[PDB]
Amino acid sequence: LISQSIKNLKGGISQQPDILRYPDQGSRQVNGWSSETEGLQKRPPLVFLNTLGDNLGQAPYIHLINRDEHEQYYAVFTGSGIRVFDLSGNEKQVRYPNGSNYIKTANPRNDLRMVTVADYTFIVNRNVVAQKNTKSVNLPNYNPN
């Protein structure tokens, strides 16, 4: 009559068949939090702050900005335009002084980028290609003779 104890439960799925897999590895695990000292726990809940919508871009590109402790906002890049929430959940206004013409994309996940430093928050479209403009030259013709 034998017996053995599995000391830890860390952790998680192992879709490898059960005569191969290690102990500590369950076959499914939902809402678990395999910590270091304590084993399985429930994941801590979702507080509500607060709400913002009706099912925002249908599939958007969302990337936060984390400048200071008092300065922590989002950036939601919907198919229509830029929308910014804070970290308390209310909307804050953006403005298009130069036209949008750059965020209107069917797939803003696959096509928009955002590189962010404390001085500048770059927003990159990947579909658009950048050309030279033929309007502003130095001299119009200038036959150099």
Binding site: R67, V115, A118
Partner: peptide
């Protein structure tokens, strides 16, 4: 300045 892609005060 710095050489990173994430905000680092």
């Amino acid at each position: 300045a710095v050489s990173t892609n994430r905000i680092a005060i």
